[PDB]
Design a protein around this ligand. Structure first.
Ligand SMILES: *Cc1c(COP(=O)(O)O)cnc(C)c1O
Ligand SMILES: *Cc1c(COP(=O)(O)O)cnc(C)c1O
Lengths: 396, 396
C-alpha cells in the first residue's frame, strides 16, 4: 500500500527552523518564525495564563468530555470579543460558536461544513496569503483562487486591483479576509475601505470568511474588529475563524473558534447542527485546557485586566520595534526608505527584500527570514537591531 | 447560503444525556454514557494526572508550537505500550507516531492519509461497531462495509460468520479491528483467534487498522496488546489509532495517537510525511497539555507506578461489577442466564435487552441504557446494583 507513496515537499518553514538550530554562529537572528518574542528573545507563558492554570489545577474535579461545540462561556466571550458587548447579532441570537483546536482547526471545520452542506466550490484568498489557507481548503475539496492585494511599489494595499480581481468571483463563492494584521504583509484596510468591501460583498453575493489570528495586535481589541463589524452590520451570513494562539500565548494548546452567523436563530441553529456534525467526524470534541484558560481569564475582571495589559505590552513593543527598525536603517545608510514599516500592523511585515537578498542574509550574516521577505518584527530587540540593520544595508 | 440546510439528525447519545439530566426522579441510573465512573458515581481526575499537571504548571516556560507529529517522548512511550519494550518494529524504526486530538482524531488523520495517498476506497467495521467510525471514514470519502461479529444467541464472537463475511473484502481494503474491550459488545478474540485473523489478513491482502480505546481495561496493559502484536509480527503494513481518554481519564484534553507501520524506515518516513501533510491541513499541530501529562507520567518511574495501579484499580472494579451484576440478577429471580457478562471485557457489555425493554427501563424505572442494549458497567456501583437489577428483572 505504502510502497510508492510520493514524499511531501520539504517544507521551508521547518527547514528554516532546522537550519537556524544547526547554525553554530553566535550572532544569528531569527525573523522567520510565526510566534511572538519578547525583549529577551523568548516566547513566555503569560502571567494571566499561569494564574488561570493554577486555579484549574486546584478546582477541576473531572476531565469528562466537553460538548462538540466546547465550553459555553468560551463561546460567549469569543462572540463579545468579535462583535462587541451590545451587538445586535448576539442579541438576536444569530451567531453560534464552536470551540476548535486553533484557528487552523476553525478554518478546516468551516471548510468541511461548507463543502458538505452548501454549494460552495471555491474560496478567494489574498495574494500573498498565509500558505496554510490553501492546503486547508484544498483538503475539504475547495478550489482556491487569488485576488490582488499587495502594491509592491508603494508597500500599500493595491485597492483598485483588489476590487478588479474580485469581480471575477461569482455569487456563492467564499472570500477570505484577514480581520487585522494581515499575514504576511501587515497591510490592513482602513475602515472606509472595509465599509466599501462590505458593500461590494453584499451586492456581489460573497459569503465572507474572516480569519482573526491577531486580534489586539494592530491598534486594540475593539479597533481591530471594526472591519469585521462593518461586514456584520451589512450581512445576513458570515463565518469567523478566530485564534487565541498569539494574544494569549497559548499556541500549543490549540485554542480557537469557528463562529457561524445566519439571518436568524432558527437558521443558525440548524446550520450549526451540521457544523457540529463536521466536528464529530473530525476530532469528536475540542481540547479543554487551553480554552478553559481563556474562558477563566475573560470572565474574571481581575485576570482580564491583567491579560489586556499583557496584550497591550506586546502590541506596544512591536510598535517600538517598527520605529527603531526604520530609524536604525536610516542612520546606518539605508539605500531605501523603510517608513512604510511603521504604518504596517502586527507581528509581520513584508520587508520588500528579494529571495536572493533573503538567501544572502542567511548565508553571509546569519539573519533568517522567509523567502517572500516576510519578517517577524517581534523577533527584533534593542540588542539585535544594530547587527540586523547592518546586515540588511549590506545586501541592498 | 444557509437558508435550506438540512438539520443533523437528533443524536440519541446527547438526547439520552439530556433526558437523564431532566429526569427529576432521585433513583435514576445512567448506564448509557461512554466514560468511566468510580464507586461514588463520578469521573475523577487521576492522582497521577494531577501530579503531572502540577509539575507542568511549575516548569513550563513556553507554549510554543509542537511539531506536526507532537511530543517525541509521547510517541516513543506510545510505541512501547503498543508493541512492547523489545519490539523489532521499534528496533528497525518501522513505526512513526503522530500525537493526535484523541482516538477519533487519529482515525480521521488515518482516513485522510489513506484517502489522499493510497488506493483505499472502503473500510470494514464490525457489526455492531461504535457509530463514530462510520462518520469519520465517510467524511474522508471512504465507503464503510460491515462484517459479522456478534453471536446474538450465545453472546459470543460468531467467528465462522466473521471469516465468511470478510472473504467479500478485496485486497487493498482496510479492515478495522478493536484491539481489546470491543465497543459495544465487550467481546474480544482470543489469542488463537487473533493469530488466525492475522494469518488470513496477510493472504487476503487487507491493510489492518487497530482502534485501541481501552488498553489496560481487559486483562492488563501487555495482555490487551497481544492481538495487535500478533498482527504486527505477520504484517509489513499496519495503522493504529490509540486513545488515552479512558486509561488516563483525560477525555476532554483529546489525547491520542496515530501510529504508521511500514516495511522499512525509508518507506515509513516517506509515508509519514504525507500523514503530517494531512495533519497540517486539519488542525496544524496537536494540543500539548494532555499529551504532556501522559508523557510526563509514562517516562517517570514513580508516576508510572502510581498510574498503573490506578488503571489496575479501574480494571478490577469493573470486573467486580460484572460479577456482582450476574449474582444480583441470579438472586433476584433472573428470567435468563447472564453468565456471559463475566467473560466480556472492559467498559461495555451488550446486555441483550431489546430496544423496547431499554425504552421501558427508562420510562418506568429511570434506568438509562443505549437503544442497542449496550450498558456501561462502570456506571454500576454496590449501592445502585439492587435497584438496577430489580428494574431489569421486571422488564424481562
Ligand atoms: C498565526 C496565524 C494563525 C494561527 O493558527 P492557529 O491554528 O490558531 O495557531 C491563523 N491564521 C493566520 C493568518 C495566522 O497568521
Ligand atoms: C471511547 C472510544 C474511543 C475514544 O475516542 P477519543 O477521541 O479518544 O475520546 C475511541 N474508539 C472507541 C471504540 C471507543 O470506545
Amino acid at each position: 500500500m505504502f510502497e510508492n507513496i510520493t514524499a511531501a515537499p520539504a517544507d521551508p518553514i521547518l527547514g528554516l527552523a532546522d537550519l537556524f538550530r544547526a547554525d553554530e554562529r553566535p550572532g544569528k537572528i531569527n525573523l522567520g518564525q510565526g510566534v511572538y518574542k519578547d525583549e529577551t528573545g523568548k516566547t513566555p507563558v503569560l502571567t494571566s495564563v499561569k494564574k488561570a492554570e493554577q486555579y484549574l489545577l486546584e478546582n477541576e474535579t473531572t476531565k469528562n468530555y466537553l460538548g462538540i461545540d466546547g465550553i459555553p462561556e468560551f463561546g460567549r466571550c469569543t462572540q463579545e470579543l468579535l462583535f462587541g458587548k451590545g451587538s445586535a447579532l448576539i442579541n438576536d441570537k444569530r451567531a453560534r460558536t464552536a470551540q476548535t483546536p486553533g484557528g487552523t482547526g476553525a478554518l478546516r471545520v468551516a471548510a468541511d461544513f461548507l463543502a458538505k452542506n452548501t454549494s460552495v466550490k471555491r474560496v478567494w484568498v489574498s495574494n500573498p496569503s498565509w500558505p496554510n489557507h490553501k492546503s486547508v481548503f484544498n483538503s475539504a475539496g475547495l478550489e482556491v483562487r487569488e485576488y490582488a492585494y499587495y502594491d509592491a511599489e508603494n508597500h500599500t494595499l493595491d485597492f483598485d486591483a483588489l476590487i478588479n480581481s474580485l469581480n471575477e468571483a461569482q455569487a456563492g463563492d467564499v472570500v477570505l479576509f484577514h480581520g487585522c494584521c494581515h499575514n504576511p504583509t501587515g497591510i490592513d484596510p482602513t475602515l472606509e475601505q472595509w465599509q466599501t468591501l462590505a458593500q461590494l460583498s453584499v451586492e456581489k453575493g460573497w459569503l465572507p470568511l474572516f480569519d482573526f489570528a491577531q486580534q489586539g495586535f494592530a491598534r486594540g481589541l475593539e479597533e481591530d474588529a471594526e472591519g469585521l463589524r462593518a461586514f456584520a452590520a451589512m450581512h445576513k451570513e458570515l463565518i469567523v475563524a478566530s485564534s487565541y494562539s498569539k494574544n494569549f500565548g497559548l499556541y500549543n494548546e490549540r485554542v480557537g473558534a469557528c463562529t457561524l452567523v445566519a439571518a436568524d436563530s432558527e437558521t443558525v441553529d440548524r446550520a450549526f447542527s451540521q457544523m457540529k456534525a463536521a466536528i464529530y467526524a473530525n476530532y469528536s470534541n475540542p481540547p479543554a485546557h487551553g480554552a478553559s484558560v481563556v474562558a477563566t481569564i475573560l470572565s474574571n475582571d481581575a485576570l482580564r485586566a491583567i491579560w489586556e495589559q499583557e496584550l497591550t505590552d506586546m502590541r506596544q513593543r512591536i510598535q517600538r520595534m517598527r520605529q527603531l527598525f526604520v530609524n536604525t536603517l536610516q542612520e546606518k545608510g539605508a539605500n531605501r526608505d523603510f517608513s512604510f514599516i511603521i504604518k504596517q500592523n502586527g507581528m509581520f511585515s513584508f520587508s520588500g527584500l528579494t529571495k536572493e537578498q533573503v538567501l544572502r542574509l542567511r548565508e553571509e550574516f546569519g539573519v533568517y527570514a522567509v523567502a517572500s521577505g516576510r519578517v517577524n518584527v517581534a523577533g527584533m530587540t534593542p540588542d539585535n537591531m544594530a547587527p540586523l540593520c547592518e546586515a540588511i544595508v549590506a545586501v541592498l
